[PDB]
Amino acid sequence: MGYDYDYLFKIVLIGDSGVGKSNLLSRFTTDEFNIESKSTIGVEFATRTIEVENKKIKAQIWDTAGLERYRAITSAYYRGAVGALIVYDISKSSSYENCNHWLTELRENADDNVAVGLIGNKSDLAHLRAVPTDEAKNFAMENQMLFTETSALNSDNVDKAFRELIVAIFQMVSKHQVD
Ligand SMILES: Nc1nc2c(ncn2[C@@H]2O[C@H](COP(=O)(O)OP(=O)(O)NP(=O)(O)O)[C@@H](O)[C@H]2O)c(=O)[nH]1
Ligand SMILES: Nc1nc2c(ncn2[C@@H]2O[C@H](COP(=O)(O)OP(=O)(O)NP(=O)(O)O)[C@@H](O)[C@H]2O)c(=O)[nH]1
Numbered sequence: 362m363g364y365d366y367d368y369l370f371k372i373v374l375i376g377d378s379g380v381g382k383s384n385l386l387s388r389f390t391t392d393e394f395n396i397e398s399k400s401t402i403g404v405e406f407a408t409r410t411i412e413v414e415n416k417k418i419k420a421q422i423w424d425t426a427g428l429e430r431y432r433a434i435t436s437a438y439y440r441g442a443v444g445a446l447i448v449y450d451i452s453k454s455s456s457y458e459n460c461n462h463w464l465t466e467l468r469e470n471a472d473d474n475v476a477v478g479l480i481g482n483k484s485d486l487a488h489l490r491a492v493p494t495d496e497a498k499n500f501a502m503e504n505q506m507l508f509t510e511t512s513a514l515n516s517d518n519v520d521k522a523f524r525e526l527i528v529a530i531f532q533m534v535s536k537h538q539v540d
């Protein structure tokens with residue numbers, strides 16, 4: 362209360378430890394980055410309110426370490442989420458290859474009809490690129506996922522990545538005028 366919003370969307374970040382989930386969260390919600398961030402303790406969330414078609418959408422973004430955890434924690438994490446972002450590190454091909462493992466956790470825990478986006482983070486490390494863009498783009502298309510390469514470090518495409526997901530959920534859950 363105190364805040365006028367039309368929608369609240371819970372969105373979860375999933376992906377290997379180290380890919381940059383927490384920095385994506387912090388960059389998107391509070392415009393902060395930390396080069397010395399460590400593995401996440403417990404579960405955290407932050408919120409940013411954006412505007413789409415003149416409606417205010419509260420985007421509540423959840424974060425937890427990309428590591429094995431108990432069933433009760435993972436169920437609470439996914440519960441109520443209407444969007445997910447699967448994150449890999451464009452400089453680390455093993456993280457990208459593990460995306461199918463994250464897709465599996467998603468299918469196993471997520472509510473019906475969640476919007477899914479794939480993010481290749483750390484695009485500022487293109488001098489050490491291990492994952493070709495066209496390969497990742499194709500993988501996203503094959504699995505009906507949004508796709509963006511981002512850098513939490515320099516802010517490149519971070520708003521774009523989150524906004525596109527939010528706009529996609531918004532599209533789904535509201536009525537729209539034609540012409
Ligand atoms: N809780 C609450 N907040 C309101 C209400 N009306 C306006 N506000 C706050 O006042 C802010 C400024 O109003 P408004 O200009 O309508 O915001 P917008 O965000 O719609 N800006 P433009 O529309 O861009 O100014 C709103 O963004 C909102 O945070 C209200 O009825 N209840
Ligand atoms: N160069 C660069 N480094 C990044 C970028 N994003 C995150 N990092 C760095 O990569 C490291 C890991 O980031 P972090 O956000 O903590 O990853 P995480 O996915 O949250 N890990 P965990 O799951 O364990 O909690 C940190 O040193 C962080 O600063 C980026 O866009 N570019």
Ligand SMILES: [Mg+2]
Nearest residue numbers: 382383400401
């Ligand atoms: Mg983290």
